[PDB]
Amino acid sequence: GHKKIEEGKLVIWINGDKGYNGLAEVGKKFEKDTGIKVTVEHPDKLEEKFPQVAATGDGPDIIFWAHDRFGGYAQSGLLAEITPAAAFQDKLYPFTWDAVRYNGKLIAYPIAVEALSLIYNKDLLPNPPKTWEEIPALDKELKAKGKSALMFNLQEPYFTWPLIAADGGYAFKYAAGKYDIKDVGVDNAGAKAGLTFLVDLIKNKHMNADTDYSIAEAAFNKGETAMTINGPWAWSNIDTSAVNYGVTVLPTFKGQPSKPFVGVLSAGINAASPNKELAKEFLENYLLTDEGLEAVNKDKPLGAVALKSYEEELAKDPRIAATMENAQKGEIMPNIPQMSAFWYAVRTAVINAASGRQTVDAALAAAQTNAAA
Ligand SMILES: OC[C@H]1O[C@H](O[C@H]2[C@H](O)[C@@H](O)[C@@H](O)O[C@@H]2CO)[C@H](O)[C@@H](O)[C@@H]1O
Ligand SMILES: [Cu+2]
3-state secondary structure the chain: CCCCCCCCCEEEECCCCCCHHHHHHHHHHHHHHHCCCEEEECCCCHHHHHHHHHHCCCCCCEEEEEHHHHHHHHHCCCECCCCCCHHHHCCECHHHHHHCEECCEECCEEEEEECCEEEEECCCCCCCCCECCCHHHHHHHHHCCCCEEECCCCCCHHHHHHHHHHCCCEEEEEECCEEEEEEEECCCHHHHHHHHHHHHHHHCCCCCCCCCHHHHHHHHHCCCEEEEEECHHHHHHHHHCCCCEEEECCCEECCEECCCEEEEEEEEEECCCCCHHHHHHHHHHHHCCHHHHHHHHHHCCCCEECEHHHHHHHCCCHHHHHHHHHHHHCEECCCCCCHHHHHHHHHHHHHHHHHCCCCHHHHHHHHHHHHCC
Checking DSSP bridges between strand 62-66 and strand 10-13, what pairing results, if any?
Answer: parallel
Cα radius of gyration (the chain): 21
**Cβ proximity of 55 and 74 under 8 Å:** no
Q: Does 114 contact ligand 1 (Cβ within 6 A)?
A: yes
Rounded CA separation 254/131 (Å):
8
Q: Whose CA is nearest to atom 17 of ligand 1?
A: 156
Q: Is the CB of 134 under 6 A from ligand 1?
A: no
Residue 176 exposed, middle or buried by CB count within 10 Å (0-12, 13-18, 19+): exposed
Determine the Cα–Cα distance for residues 310 and 198; give it in Å rounded to an integer.
38
Q: How would you label 215-244 residue by residue, b for 16+ Cβ within 10 Å and e otherwise?
A: bbbebbbebbbbbbbbbbbbbeebeeeebe
- Cα(240)–Cα(271) distance, rounded to whole angstroms? 40
How far apart CA 92 and CA 308 sit, in angstroms, is: 6
| Contact criterion met (CB below 8 Å) for 91 and 306 | no
Instruction: Report whether 115 contacts 330 (CB < 8 A).
Output: yes
Ligand nearest the Cα atom of residue 11:
2
Query: What was the resolution (in A) of this experimentally determined structure?
Result: 2.7
- d(C-alpha 172, C-alpha 179), whole Å: 6
Distance from the CA of 98 to the center of ligand 2, in angstroms? 37
Backbone angles phi, psi at 265, to 5 degrees: -55, 125
Topology alike, domains 10-114+262-332 and 117-259+338-371? yes
Amino acid letter, residue 126:
P
Distance CA 284, CA 278 (A): 10
Ligand 1 within 6 A of CB of 157: yes
Cβ–ligand 1 distance for 15 under 6 Å, the answer yes
Question: With contact defined as beta carbons under 8 Å apart, do 251 and 197 qualify?
Answer: no
80 and 270 Cβ atoms separated by less than 8 Å? yes
10-114+262-332, what's its fold?
D-Maltodextrin-Binding Protein; domain 2 (3.40.190)
Q: Which atom of ligand 1 is nearest to the CA of 263?
A: 9
> Around Cβ 137, how many Cβ atoms within 10 Å?
12
CA of 18 relative to ligand 1 center, distance in Å:
12
CA distances from 5 to 42, 61, 106, 275 (A): 17, 7, 23, 9
Ligand closest in space to the Cα of 350: 1
**Inter-residue contact 323 to 297 (CB < 8 Å):** no
Closest listed ligand to the CA of 335: 1
> Residues 252-281, buried b or exposed e (16+ Cβ, 10 A)?
bbeeebbbbbbbbbbbbbbbbbebbebbbb
Taking the alpha carbons of 330, 334, 340, 341 in that order, is the dihedral positive or negative?
A: negative
d(CA 300, CA 296): 6
Are 367 and 187 within 8 A, CB to CB? yes
CA dist 137 and 260 (Å) reads 24
Largest alpha-carbon pair distance within the chain?
Answer: 62
Nearest-CA residue for atom 4 of ligand 1: 158
Out of 15, 18, 158, give the residue to mutate to test ligand 1, the one with the largest number of ligand atoms within 8 Å of its CB: 158
Residue 164 neighbours by CB under 8 Å, 6+ apart? 157, 186, 190, 191, 194, 195, 198, 346, 350
CATH class of 117-259+338-371: alpha beta
Beta carbons within 8 Å of 291's beta carbon, 6+ residues apart: 29
Q: Which atom of ligand 1 is nearest to the CA of 15?
A: 13
Can you give the residue ranges of every domain in the chain? 10-114+262-332, 117-259+338-371
Is residue 61 within 8 Å of 269, Cβ to Cβ?
A: yes
Nearest CA to ligand 1 atom 23: 343
d(CA 75, CA 54): 13
Rounded to whole angstroms, the Cα distance separating 166 from 194 reads 7
Q: State in Å: Cα 116 to ligand 1 middle.
A: 11
Backbone angles phi, psi at 107, to 5 degrees: -120, 5
Closest of 38, 19, 22 to residue 30, by C-alpha: 38
User: In testing the pocket of ligand 1, which one of 156, 264, 338 has its CB within 8 Å of the most ligand atoms?
Assistant: 156
Pocket of ligand 1 contains residue 260 by CB under 6 Å:
no
Q: 70 CB less than 6 Å from ligand 1?
A: no
Q: How far is it, in rounded angstroms, from Cα 146 to Cα 226?
A: 11
Return the number of other C-beta atoms located less than 10 Å from residue 31's C-beta: 14
Strand-pair category, 304-305 with 117-121 = unpaired
